[PDB]
């Protein structure tokens, strides 16, 4: 596997978005992974609709602004036959009527692949060979809310009780040695003003810190 990976540098990642006051991070994590896989398939980067997932995936077990799961979102896109673009189905951060329009669909998936739970090396192999990967993490800390720079490490993090979905867009390391000061490159959905231009470096190979490899997955396009 490569010493470092950064899918943003290859055109697979849309600019940072903002879920605002709606518990839809699972929808942003799923659209981010589908955006990367659709770009790997077609060469076209198209921003996808989180609101389509918030309003329409209750049958699959999501709860809109009250939370949801990235795998249930990829299940909805499979059962539904498509997912609309961000431009055609705009984000409003509140639960609304499902307005899915097949004529505006720009993405599809046949299901999803799960990464072995808790295995950071399996997650590293998926990020390197597939593209951006949906992951859940423990973001329930003021250290995360006010994160600004550097490798994030929080002693109070959990690897099993997770409350937020994010997108791993790569991994890297600080310095000359590729085997230490490692980190996961994570795209959040709290706007570009949060964190480091909307991203955070989470400590890597530090016992699955904040649960990043506990429940990772990606859509099959």
């Amino acid at each position: 596997l490569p010493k470092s990976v950064d899918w943003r540098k290859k055109g697979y990642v849309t600019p940072v978005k903002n879920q605002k006051q709606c518990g839809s991070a699972w929808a942003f994590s799923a659209t981010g992974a589908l955006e990367g896989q659709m770009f790997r398939k077609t060469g076209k980067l198209v921003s996808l609709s989180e609101q389509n997932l918030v309003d329409c995936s209750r049958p699959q077990g999501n709860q809109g602004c009250n939370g949801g799961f990235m795998a249930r979102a990829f299940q909805y896109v499979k059962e539904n036959g498509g997912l609309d673009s961000e431009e055609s189905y705009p984000y409003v951060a509140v639960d609304e009527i499902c307005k899915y329009r097949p004529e505006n669909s720009v993405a599809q998936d046949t299901g999803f692949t799960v990464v072995a739970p808790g295995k950071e090396k399996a997650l590293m192999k998926a990020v390197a060979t597939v593209g951006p990967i949906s992951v859940a993490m423990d973001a329930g800390h003021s250290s995360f809310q006010f994160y600004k720079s550097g490798i994030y490490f929080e002693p109070d993090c959990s690897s099993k009780n997770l409350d937020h979905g994010v997108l791993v867009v790569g991994y890297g390391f600080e310095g000359a040695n590729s085997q230490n000061s490692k980190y996961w490159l994570v795209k959040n959905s709290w706007g570009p003003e949060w964190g480091s231009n909307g991203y955070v470096k989470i400590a890597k190979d530090k016992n699955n810190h904040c649960g990043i490899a506990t429940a990772a997955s990606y859509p099959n396009v």
Partner: peptide, 8 residues
């Protein structure tokens, strides 16, 4: 695997 909490 993580259904203990929804991912808000």
């Amino acid at each position: 695997g993580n259904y203990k909490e929804a991912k808000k």
